[PDB]
């Protein structure tokens, strides 16, 4: 808590409060199509998409991304600039410069094994060069590397299956620009409801230069004044930056800080959600199944009420699909639509049948070799799904995970495939990632202390003695401090560690049979020799723990400290450690939610815990379906019982992770524990 922390915590409030139709970098070819609209009396329409091109050419003579260079889309920018500049007689310093680029570098194109391929080039390209040859730009039509590229356009046109793209709203309209013979009477009722061809700038000014529609001009003058005479690849981005922001700054371990803007965001998220899912942008008559798996993701998650009903249309014979009647199946997209089906409840299906979907679809990618997405160059794509694959939802402790996560996160660096490359600086930030590194050091700095208090109760109560063994502590502790990690929270964090080892101590010292139980029993009530020792080490550290929060916080609770373990002695001397530590925590809240211990939903998921948490594959599989319903419960609460049934799933979620993972945690343990970030 820094000032510095603190101001940069108000930097991302300031971002969140004033998100509005996305923060997306312009696209030059986009600018070049707006700047070729001819207003009626042979001048531009926009003279200030003319002079963005101008003034924002490259040094070298190119347009495109500055810090990402692609030949690809290099060239594709370059040329528009060139034919939008030429067209007008304007800027000839700048086209002369952009012409002197594109004949040095066409040769190039194929040069890189790895670039990837602007959506679109193959088609958009060609289209370009005819533009050009018209108005008698003296480029290298001829150029050897230009043979494949026209071929490839004539296949592709005649595959388009393009009278159903006059019928019903497709991605085909979002690139207009490169198709002949349209029926611009049905195209017109296809348009969407902010005038745009499926919220692309430039098919909208094709379509524009084609029909003089008013609201395609009131769609690119939006846009245009919005980006100061740029136009990006895609607008809005509404929803996209909304659901991404609030994703990353999640998986980064830093959302707790935003809680009412990230409230906010989503129920701006939740107003445009519908039951046909969602795309990028808010109202439209198409949607994808990655803005639809992160939305209903999130707000499954925030406790909105979603259907999975929404998965419908995205599915085909068993496999799902990035959008309806297109064959593509991106890694990014079937990564989310793993996460999302992760939430599913017992009831749903469809969920299941994503599930398994995507995880083979994602495993076979893995073990191919091909984690590469058409639509994002990441700093680490085989990381996250690696983690992903790995380590299921229910398994996914917040410290685990944003460990790994701040490790791959690209921050500034990633770049999105459009027709164009492009940025979302709001999705992808180095703030968000310095600030995330800030916070996850200091809660580490905290447990460290903590690890170092807990050796030294450890020692001093000679817990080995009563078959606590080192690594078992480590672990005890490690589970705790990776869910509730707060530096705030030291309290809880510490009430569960201790718990646990003191169970496990008990059982391991008096569990063996009837007599040795009660022999425990009646001594912890008492307070035969040892049993007293050990249930003075147990009475010592509650009265420890107690004292500490009543000079901290003001509360006193010893009385229910005592009452909850002598409820779980009596279960165990006859025969729940779940429902102990979940009391345990909730006990050492700085607030009184006790008063929830008596209520028909706690006891409902007291059951249910007491189930998971038992005394492989097969008890694995029993765990899970038990999970999913107290995740059904939990996700369907009340506010201020909303924290209780957190805490009955951030239990549940260290025991599956500990059966599942439990045998193999040493890298996991130093990484989140012992090896700073950064
Ligand atoms: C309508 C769009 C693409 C064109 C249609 C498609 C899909 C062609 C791939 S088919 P193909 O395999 O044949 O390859 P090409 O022919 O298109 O080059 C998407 C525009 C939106 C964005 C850029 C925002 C994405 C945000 N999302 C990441 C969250």
Same mark, same amino acid.
């Given at each position: 808590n820094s000032n510095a922390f603190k101001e940069a915590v108000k930097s991302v409030k300031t971002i969140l409060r004033n998100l509005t139709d996305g923060e997306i970098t312009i696209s030059a070819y986009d600018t070049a199509w707006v700047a070729? %609209? &001819?207003?009626?009396?042979? $001048?531009?329409?926009?003279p200030s998409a003319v002079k963005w091109i101008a003034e924002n050419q490259l040094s070298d003579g190119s347009w495109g991304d500055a810090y990402l260079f692609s030949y690809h889309d290099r060239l594709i920018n370059t040329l528009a600039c060139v034919v939008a500049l030429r067209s007008w007689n304007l800027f000839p310093h700048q086209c002369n410069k952009g012409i002197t680029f594109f004949r040095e570098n066409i040769?190039?194109?194929?040069?890189? /094994?790895?670039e990837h391929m602007p959506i679109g080039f193959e088609v958009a390209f060609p289209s370009l060069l005819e533009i050009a040859r018209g108005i008698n %730009? &003296?480029?290298?039509? &001829?150029?050897?590397?230009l043979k494949d590229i026209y071929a490839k356009k004539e296949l592709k046109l005649t595959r388009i299956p393009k009278e159903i793209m006059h019928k019903i709203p497709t991605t085909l309209l979002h690139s207009?620009?490169?198709?002949?013979?349209? &029926?611009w009477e049905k195209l017109l009722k296809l348009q969407?409801?902010?005038?745009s061809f499926l919220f692309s700038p430039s098919s909208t000014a094709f379509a524009f230069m084609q029909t003089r529609d008013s609201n395609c001009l009131e769609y690119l003058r939006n846009a245009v004044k919005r980006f100061n005479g740029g136009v990006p690849n895609? @607008?809005?981005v509404d929803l996209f930056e909304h659901i991404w922001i609030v994703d990353r700054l999640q998986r980064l371990g830093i959302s707790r800080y935003f809680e009412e803007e990230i409230k906010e965001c989503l129920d701006y998220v939740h107003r445009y959600w519908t039951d046909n899912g969602i795309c990028?942008?808010?109202?439209?008559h198409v949607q994808d199944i990655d803005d639809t798996a992160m939305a209903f993701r999130l707000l499954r998650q925030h406790g909105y009420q979603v259907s999975a009903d929404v998965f419908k249309n995205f599915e085909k014979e068993g496999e799902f699909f990035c @959008?309806?009647?297109?064959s593509n199946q991106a890694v990014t997209g079937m990564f989310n639509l793993y996460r999302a089906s992760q939430?599913? @409840?017992?009831?749903?299906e469809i969920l299941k049948n994503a599930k398994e979907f995507s995880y083979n679809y994602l495993l076979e990618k893995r073990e191919r070799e091909?984690? %590469?997405?058409?639509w994002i160059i990441m700093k680490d794509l085989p990381g996250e799904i690696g983690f992903a694959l790995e380590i299921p939802w229910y398994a996914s402790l917040p410290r685990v995970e944003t460990r790994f996560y701040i490790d791959q996160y690209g921050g500034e660096n990633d770049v999105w495939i459009g027709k164009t490359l492009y940025r979302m600086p709001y999705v992808n930030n180095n703030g968000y990632l310095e600030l995330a590194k800030q916070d996850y050091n200091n809660c580490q700095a905290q447990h460290q202390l903590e690890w170092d208090i807990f050796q030294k109760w450890y020692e001093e109560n000679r817990l080995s003695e009563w078959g606590v063994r080192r690594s078992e502590l480590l672990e005890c502790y490690y589970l705790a401090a990776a869910t %509730?990690?707060?530096?705030?929270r030291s309290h809880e964090r510490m009430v569960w560690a201790k718990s646990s080892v003191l169970v496990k101590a008990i059982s391991s010292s008096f569990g063996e049979s009837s007599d040795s139980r009660r022999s425990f029993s009646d001594q912890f009530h008492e307070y035969s020799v040892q049993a007293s020792r050990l249930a003075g080490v147990l009475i010592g550290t509650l009265n420890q723990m107690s004292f500490d929060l009543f000079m901290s916080?003001?509360?006193?609770?010893n009385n229910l400290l005592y009452l909850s373990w002598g409820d779980w002695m009596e279960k165990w001397k006859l025969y729940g450690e779940g429902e102990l530590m979940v009391k345990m925590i909730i006990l050492m809240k /700085? /607030?009184?939610? $006790? /008063?929830? @211990? $008596?209520?028909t939903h706690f006891v409902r998921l007291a059951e249910i815990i007491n189930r998971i948490c038992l005394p492989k594959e097969k008890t694995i599989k029993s765990m899970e379906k038990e999970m999913g319903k107290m995740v059904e419960l939990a996700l369907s609460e009340s506010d201020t019982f909303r924290d209780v049934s957190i805490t009955f799933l951030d239990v549940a979620k260290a025991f599956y992770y500990f059966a599942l993972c439990?045998?193999?945690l040493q890298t996991h343990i130093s990484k989140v524990l012992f090896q700073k970030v950064g």
């Open positions: 070729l %609209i &001819d207003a009626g009396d042979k $001048t531009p329409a926009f040769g190039k194109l194929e040069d890189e /094994n790895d %730009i &003296d480029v290298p039509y &001829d150029s050897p590397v207009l620009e490169g198709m002949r013979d349209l &029926d969407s409801q902010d005038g895609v @607008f809005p990028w942008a808010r109202c439209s @959008f309806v009647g297109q939430l599913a @409840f017992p009831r749903e091909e984690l %590469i997405d058409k %509730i990690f707060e530096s705030e916080h003001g509360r006193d609770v /700085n /607030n009184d939610l $006790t /008063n929830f @211990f $008596t209520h439990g045998d193999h």
